[PDB]
Amino acid sequence: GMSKLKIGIIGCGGIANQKHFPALKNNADLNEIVAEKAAAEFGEGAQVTADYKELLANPEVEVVHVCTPNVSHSEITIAAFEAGKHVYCEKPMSHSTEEAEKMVEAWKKSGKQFTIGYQNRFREEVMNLKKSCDKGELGEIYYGKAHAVRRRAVPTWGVFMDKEAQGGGPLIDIGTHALDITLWCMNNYDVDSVTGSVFYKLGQKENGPEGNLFGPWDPKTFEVEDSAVGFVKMKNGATIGLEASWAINMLDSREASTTLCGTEAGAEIHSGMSYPKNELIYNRARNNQLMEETLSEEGTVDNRQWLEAIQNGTEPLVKPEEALAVTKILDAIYKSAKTNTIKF
Amino acid sequence: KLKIGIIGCGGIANQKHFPALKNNADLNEIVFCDIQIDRAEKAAAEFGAEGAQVTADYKELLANPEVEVVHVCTPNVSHSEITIAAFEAGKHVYCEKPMSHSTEEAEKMVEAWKKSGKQFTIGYQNRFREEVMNLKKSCDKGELGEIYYGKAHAVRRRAVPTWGVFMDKEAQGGGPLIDIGTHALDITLWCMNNYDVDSVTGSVFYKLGQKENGPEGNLFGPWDPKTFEVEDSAVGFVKMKNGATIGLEASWAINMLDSREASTTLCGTEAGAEIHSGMSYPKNELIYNRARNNQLMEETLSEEGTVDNRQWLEAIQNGTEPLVKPEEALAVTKILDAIYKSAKTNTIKF
Amino acid sequence: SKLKIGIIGCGGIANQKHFPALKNNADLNEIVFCDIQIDRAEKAAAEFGAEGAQVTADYKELLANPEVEVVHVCTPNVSHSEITAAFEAGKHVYCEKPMSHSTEEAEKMVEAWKKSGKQFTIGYQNRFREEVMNLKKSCDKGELGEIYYGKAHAVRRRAVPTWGVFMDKEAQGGGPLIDIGTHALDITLWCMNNYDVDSVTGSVFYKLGQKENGPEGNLFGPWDPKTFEVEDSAVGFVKMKNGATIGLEASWAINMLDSREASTTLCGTEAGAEIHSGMSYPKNELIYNRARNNQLMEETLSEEGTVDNRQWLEAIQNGTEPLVKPEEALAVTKILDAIYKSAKTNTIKF
Numbered sequence A: 001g002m003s004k005l006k007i008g009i010i011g012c013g014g015i016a017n018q019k020h021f022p023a024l025k026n027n028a029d030l031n032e033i034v035a036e037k038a039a040a041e042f043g044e045g046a047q048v049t050a051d052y053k054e055l056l057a058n059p060e061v062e063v064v065h066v067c068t069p070n071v072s073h074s075e076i077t078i079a080a081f082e083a084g085k086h087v088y089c090e091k092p093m094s095h096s097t098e099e100a101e102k103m104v105e106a107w108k109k110s111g112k113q114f115t116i117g118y119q120n121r122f123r124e125e126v127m128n129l130k131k132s133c134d135k136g137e138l139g140e141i142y143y144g145k146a147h148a149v150r151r152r153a154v155p156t157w158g159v160f161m162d163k164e165a166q167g168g169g170p171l172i173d174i175g176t177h178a179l180d181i182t183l184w185c186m187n188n189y190d191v192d193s194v195t196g197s198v199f200y201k202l203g204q205k206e207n208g209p210e211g212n213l214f215g216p217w218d219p220k221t222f223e224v225e226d227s228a229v230g231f232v233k234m235k236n237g238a239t240i241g242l243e244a245s246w247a248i249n250m251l252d253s254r255e256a257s258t259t260l261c262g263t264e265a266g267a268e269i270h271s272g273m274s275y276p277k278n279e280l281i282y283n284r285a286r287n288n289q290l291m292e293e294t295l296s297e298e299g300t301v302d303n304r305q306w307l308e309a310i311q312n313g314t315e316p317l318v319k320p321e322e323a324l325a326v327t328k329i330l331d332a333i334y335k336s337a338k339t340n341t342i343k344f
Numbered sequence B: 001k002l003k004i005g006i007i008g009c010g011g012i013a014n015q016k017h018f019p020a021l022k023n024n025a026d027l028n029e030i031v032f033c034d035i036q037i038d039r040a041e042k043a044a045a046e047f048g049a050e051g052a053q054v055t056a057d058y059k060e061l062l063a064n065p066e067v068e069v070v071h072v073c074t075p076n077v078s079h080s081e082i083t084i085a086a087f088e089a090g091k092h093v094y095c096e097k098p099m100s101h102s103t104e105e106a107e108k109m110v111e112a113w114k115k116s117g118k119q120f121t122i123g124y125q126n127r128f129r130e131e132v133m134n135l136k137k138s139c140d141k142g143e144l145g146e147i148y149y150g151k152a153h154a155v156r157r158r159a160v161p162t163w164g165v166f167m168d169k170e171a172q173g174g175g176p177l178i179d180i181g182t183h184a185l186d187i188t189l190w191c192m193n194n195y196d197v198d199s200v201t202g203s204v205f206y207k208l209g210q211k212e213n214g215p216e217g218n219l220f221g222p223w224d225p226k227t228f229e230v231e232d233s234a235v236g237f238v239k240m241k242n243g244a245t246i247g248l249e250a251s252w253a254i255n256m257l258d259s260r261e262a263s264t265t266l267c268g269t270e271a272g273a274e275i276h277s278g279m280s281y282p283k284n285e286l287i288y289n290r291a292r293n294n295q296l297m298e299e300t301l302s303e304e305g306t307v308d309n310r311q312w313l314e315a316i317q318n319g320t321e322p323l324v325k326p327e328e329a330l331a332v333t334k335i336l337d338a339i340y341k342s343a344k345t346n347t348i349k350f
Numbered sequence C: 001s002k003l004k005i006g007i008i009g010c011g012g013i014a015n016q017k018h019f020p021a022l023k024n025n026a027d028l029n030e031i032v033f034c035d036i037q038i039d040r041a042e043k044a045a046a047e048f049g050a051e052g053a054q055v056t057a058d059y060k061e062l063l064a065n066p067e068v069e070v071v072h073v074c075t076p077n078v079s080h081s082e083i084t085a086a087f088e089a090g091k092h093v094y095c096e097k098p099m100s101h102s103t104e105e106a107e108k109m110v111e112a113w114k115k116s117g118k119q120f121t122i123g124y125q126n127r128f129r130e131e132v133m134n135l136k137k138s139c140d141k142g143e144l145g146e147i148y149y150g151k152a153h154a155v156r157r158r159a160v161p162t163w164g165v166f167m168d169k170e171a172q173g174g175g176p177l178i179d180i181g182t183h184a185l186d187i188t189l190w191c192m193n194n195y196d197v198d199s200v201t202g203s204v205f206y207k208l209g210q211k212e213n214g215p216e217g218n219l220f221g222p223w224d225p226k227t228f229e230v231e232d233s234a235v236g237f238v239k240m241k242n243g244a245t246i247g248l249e250a251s252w253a254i255n256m257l258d259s260r261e262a263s264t265t266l267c268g269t270e271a272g273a274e275i276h277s278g279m280s281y282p283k284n285e286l287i288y289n290r291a292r293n294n295q296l297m298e299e300t301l302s303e304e305g306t307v308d309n310r311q312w313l314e315a316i317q318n319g320t321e322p323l324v325k326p327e328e329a330l331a332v333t334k335i336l337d338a339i340y341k342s343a344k345t346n347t348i349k350f
């Protein structure tokens, strides 16, 4: 009935093939797919070139998915596709706040649709937590923690250690997932100030790579940080602690996680290298006894939801403003280098 | 042998001091003050040398020239007043872990000890705990490298102290930041050997303490949410001049799962560590984390009031330094105080 | 207003629950003693400020004693009726757990209470455990919804009581079904708040109690298989007029791995719950189970003998109801007798 939607993938390398294609193939029924393998392995129409402008091919495309490293995000998008298309940009909306704001402007005038690749928002336990906060079952949340820590899991295969493409280390690599979850469930985005510390300690150390989950790296060429910690004061008194790392001598490898302290109850999510099963634990007082409630994929869900928003004309879950606020906090943490607190 | 006057026979005189001095009886004998004079009496009949003294007025006990070491066991706003000439003019003093709730009054406390040529130490006994010493010994031997990220842990889901005036802001000066955070920042700063602050940022929370349902689940018991004058929690972010950052979390009531107190997390260049202690830990734990032979590994473990006390009495009997130095306790007091001052929603630069 | 208390039976529960808890609320009572062992009352009529104790070998005289206000029956299960219709002839009566082995003897115990204008409660102290109270309040708020399936756990793998007269039929009337099954059944019907029986089916087992090697492993040492005059276990299947169904298992000795007693399992329309307690459980447990935001979750916990005695004493004073109502205890007696009545190899309809 509904016409399939003609989709457009500009970059085609990791999250393009580790997520978008399969999500569009788990969901074929809704999408039209119009780095060689890609047109054939999942399309028939455009090519499998190596370029950027050989897209801009079949402008009859009505949706574009930019899975280009962070720097390309502002122009491989914005007027690029705001030229009149919908856009789904990848996990860090951009490495730079100024460029990030230059997209919500591009989209805000091309009144088409826009979302960002924050899929950890569709994890069943993440949704569980979002719903109980929206239901006010935690109360007013005044203290959160965004956990994006990796004892020794420096990614050694793609764009991630490139300070020019990606613009930073674990803080914008994985801290953006954790903080997105946190803010989103706290439903708090009014930032008052940001204090941060950024550590170059293990990345260029000689035995630094020793123990790394993905194998050794060259500490002589490591150009980003190995960890960072943030202190975020919200305009309502709520405070958010952040820690993000690819390599830190810390026991718990808990990433894409959050801890939430409300006036009525608490909750935390556990995920990452130290957790074979994701966990969600609510804590509260019930009948004058302290108690704990514990639990007894999201790639596809994220994408399907994306299409059904444009086809049906309604809002995609992760909203552009949300991802911009995540980019502005993480930029203000690196900005703390001025050994000063950034007021908003 | 050393004569001891005990100012304030509250929970701490009994729980820690009296049995500690006893076990160390070969070094001391005790002479008892507390405005509620009946608990000075009951205490005197249990730990009193023989013919003692049971004043309810502390300016009386310092008059007694047969007392040469005092142990200030009063609420915190008192610490400064006793223990300032009040004690220094009369004798050596052991003030409790808080020192002061005030930087300025703690400043005078240091000036008054010096100007008295007498010994001085604060009640930070959690450091003597063998796991804490193990870590300290290792950090001093460089076995964690340079510590660039530290966490001080002083959090309790619901264990607000109900046996005194811990919730009186005229007597305690504050709540959990100064009751229990002090213990953890100390262990953190002593292990890191870093008391040189540059910046302090903080958030203080008054949320669960005045909530009618708040006192629910509280070990220690129910409290009156209408007479809660202190915070239930605070969180901190301290940057040191070497660049190391320390995080602090303190609570008597927070809806968090992990009740870890008098504990630290230390992350360095060669290694890290974590001490676990609190209401969520029946056994105290120390874990080291390092990479050995291209493999990530963890090293775990397969009283303190007495050791602290003995060490103290011996230092005066022998003319030497007790472990807890007042400069250290003063630095903790300052940092804790700067956290509260980020009620100016400003980062305090040192 | 200290209440004058009389004790009929001084060993076991009296010496283990009553005398300690009576003492613990001494501010609301004084004791003024009996036992058939003329001397059994002494070690307590002297450890229990009876200052003038009637301390007698005959209950029927401790009853004519005018200075006795509240009579505690801690005698064996047969005596419960007699010593309780006699005391209702003037006194407030706390009879112990198995109100009676007999439905009729217990019905007689109630009319008497009514003809007395006095206070009546039963020793179902398990109701006062913090976690049993937790579940009851959740149920009462409808947080489990409609409870349609329940399980009463009164199972001991191998813990036959060998210290009293529990194995004697003429003194106890029954075995584990009314010795411990009564606790579990009471909790179960109390939190469902559903006492309207429709049918009881049951089975009673005489297998290990008179077996030669059944005493093997007994937690409380061996017993003589030729004196074992009751059942070692019994199971029951209770259907209620509202359609809810309760399962019951009770045992002193049965080859089941899980020793769970004084516990319950409730399955509701909105959520479920189970309580764990018994020789299998060093700590008591309470677990809620529900679907929350589309995921199956389980909510678990991160004394009572005195609480029971207090509310009972306080209820006498302010003329209010004790927590355990005689009608509820009678309901428990009737189901349990009906499990035995299935010696008719037939379902007993109510």
Ligand SMILES: NC(=O)c1ccc[n+]([C@@H]2O[C@H](COP(=O)([O-])OP(=O)(O)OC[C@H]3O[C@@H](n4cnc5c(N)ncnc54)[C@H](O)[C@@H]3O)[C@@H](O)[C@H]2O)c1
Pocket: A010, A011, A012, A013, A014, A015, A016, A035, A050, A051, A052, A053, A067, A068, A069, A070, A072, A076, A090, A091, A092, A117, A118, A119, A158, A159
């Ligand atoms: N979990 C997640 O959501 C997640 C995880 C990984 C990466 N990402 C994000 O995905 C993005 C890409 O990471 P990655 O590992 O896919 O990258 P990748 O490098 O593996 O693949 C991207 C490729 O796009 C190509 N490309 C570059 N510039 C282009 C241009 N101008 N025009 C056309 N094609 C161009 C290059 O081939 C580049 O390698 C980043 O924004 C990263 O943050 C998201």
Ligand SMILES: NC(=O)c1ccc[n+]([C@@H]2O[C@H](COP(=O)([O-])OP(=O)(O)OC[C@H]3O[C@@H](n4cnc5c(N)ncnc54)[C@H](O)[C@@H]3O)[C@@H](O)[C@H]2O)c1
Pocket: B007, B008, B009, B010, B011, B012, B013, B033, B034, B035, B036, B039, B056, B058, B073, B074, B075, B076, B078, B096, B097, B098, B123, B124, B125, B163, B164, B165, B179
């Ligand atoms: N781990 C530790 O080292 C530790 C533990 C607990 C408390 N403390 C410290 O001990 C101090 C309070 O002691 P507490 O916890 O036992 O509470 P507490 O209320 O039981 O003790 C205070 C006692 O001193 C008496 N008092 C008040 N003012 C007095 C005065 N001018 N002169 C004499 N007596 C006075 C009070 O009657 C009271 O009995 C605090 O500074 C607290 O921080 C230290």
Ligand SMILES: NC(=O)c1ccc[n+]([C@@H]2O[C@H](COP(=O)([O-])OP(=O)(O)OC[C@H]3O[C@@H](n4cnc5c(N)ncnc54)[C@H](O)[C@@H]3O)[C@@H](O)[C@H]2O)c1
Pocket: C008, C009, C010, C011, C012, C013, C014, C034, C035, C036, C037, C040, C059, C074, C075, C076, C077, C079, C096, C097, C098, C123, C124, C125, C163, C164, C165, C179
């Ligand atoms: N948790 C509980 O609620 C709990 C626990 C154990 C027993 N009980 C109940 O308490 C009762 C006694 O159990 P126990 O363990 O104390 O047994 P027990 O035999 O140790 O105590 C009963 C006492 O009653 C005395 N007695 C017997 N006949 C008497 C008479 N005619 N007049 C006066 N005194 C007489 C006996 O000498 C004995 O001292 C039973 O009904 C039992 O089911 C309740």
Ligand SMILES: OC[C@H]1O[C@@H](O)[C@H](O)[C@@H](O)[C@@H]1O
Pocket: A155, A160, A173, A174
């Ligand atoms: O899941 C998000 C992150 O996963 C990690 O495996 C890597 O650091 C990146 O691929 C990515 O940024």
Ligand SMILES: OC[C@H]1O[C@@H](O)[C@H](O)[C@@H](O)[C@@H]1O
Pocket: B161, B166, B179, B180, B183
């Ligand atoms: O607050 C109650 C007390 O409990 C003790 O265990 C801590 O050492 C003290 O610092 C604290 O003040």
Ligand SMILES: OC[C@H]1O[C@@H](O)[C@H](O)[C@@H](O)[C@@H]1O
Pocket: C097, C160, C161, C166, C179, C180, C183
């Ligand atoms: O069986 C031994 C005893 O243990 C107690 O817990 C029960 O309440 C009694 O009814 C029982 O007789």
